[model samples]
Target: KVFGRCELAAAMKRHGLDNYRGYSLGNWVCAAKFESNFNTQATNRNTDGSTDYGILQINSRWWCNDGRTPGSRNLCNIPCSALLSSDITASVNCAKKIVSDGNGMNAWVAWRNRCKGTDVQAWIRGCRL
Candidate 1:
């Protein structure tokens, strides 16, 4: 399922990420936009032979399995396909675990390189949340 920025913002807010989830809501919004343009079906192949799946572009090497990459910690115990769905429950759950394991949003290189210190407030722009 494809989500506009507002919809994605609303969903992220609904999921308790409006603030204080080890990262700001705007950071999550920014990360999602850059990582996948809020496209739930987004998946990309990384230069390291791993794949990124879902709105967060979670890496297959540590979060989930692509059936092609090995040494996947699979800490989320989920199939990579699960992350590519409009139902972000699994993705959010896995993401919490990833952060809990000490990676923080730094788990996504996009967050590190793009959303980290930018003034991402525009991510929510006119949303009523």
Candidate 2:
């Protein structure tokens, strides 16, 4: 079955929480539910009318500078999808870097614990150092 970006977002966030089960769901679920519904398959069309890619909603173009291929503009240069689809550990590790300064897991958990679930406040925090 084919799911839309919203559902995929939820699934991805749940997947993310499950993989990193050390943190409390309450700490993360609200923002997750609000942001892309936690969909791993989600990509954003920028306000400037460009495409950003990935489950963590990363735009591979920023990292790879080769953001075109695999038949979709959202395919990204980084391999977050391949790892998220099959290897949660690798995906989480990658997500950490894309999120935290060097992508540390504890940094991720801490952000969740501190989020207010509005305007991607948690994600904004997690994505930074």
Candidate 3:
């Protein structure tokens, strides 16, 4: 599912992403915009042979097991395919784990480049949360 901005905002809030780990909902929304453009099934194969999965683009190198990434830690203890689900609950949980592990939002390079230190509130502007 390619969620609209407002739809994605509401969904993330419902999943308790708002103000999680000092990051606002808009921060997450902004990250998602650059990470996958709100596309639930988005996937990107990295040059290192690890694949990023789903809306937040969680990587197979550490967060998930794709049966492909060499030496995957699978720290999230989930199949990489789970991240592609439109339900998004698994992806959200894994993302939470990522942030809670001292990685902060910097775990995603896209977020660092586009959403970090910016007025991310604009990402959720006009969205009735």
Candidate 4:
């Protein structure tokens, strides 16, 4: 848990991720707040037996390899643990790949359940970036 929304935004921007693939910083920040609370090591086990990892809570069902989620696509070719780092570049890139799959932020179940169509400005409130 290295950052709040403002710090996350700056880091994301440094990784060249502002408005990436049509996703706004607000989308990312809001999702992250609900997904992982900005904790890099955040993880959750789904009832489907899939595991979600990192700041965006990317699922092993499609994004990463965890050996636990059978039938997972592992499209990102990354170990789920790689996402659980203070340096979030790998997780960010993997999240972008998920977005590139045409899922947008909806690929994140948290986004699907909570952030969609919600006003995300509160996520970036007081964030100067």
lDDT of each: 0.84, 0.41, 0.94, 0.84
* Residue-level error in angstroms, candidate 4, position 69: 1.9
In the range 17-114, model 3's lDDT, one tens digit per residue, is: 99999999999999999999999999999999999999999999899999999887898999999999889899999999999998799999999998
Sort the candidates on TM-score, descending order. Answer: 3, 1, 4, 2
Error of 1 at 14 (Å): 1.0
Write the residue-wise lDDT of candidate 4 on 2-119 in tens digits. Answer: 5877999878878876789977778888888889988998989999999999898988988899989998888889899999989989998888888887667777778889888988
Comparison by TM-score, 1 against 2, better one: 1
- Model 3 TM-score? 0.97
Candidate 4 residue spans exceeding 4 A from truth = none
What TM-score fits each model? Answer: 0.91, 0.40, 0.97, 0.90
lDDT at position 34, candidate 1: 83
lDDT winner among the candidates?
3
Better of 2 and 4 by TM-score: 4
Candidate 4: which pairs clash? none
Q: Positional deviation of 75 in candidate 2, in angstroms?
A: 15
Which ten residues in a row are the worst by lDDT in model 3? Answer: 67-76
User: Alpha carbon lDDT of residue 22, candidate 4?
Assistant: 73
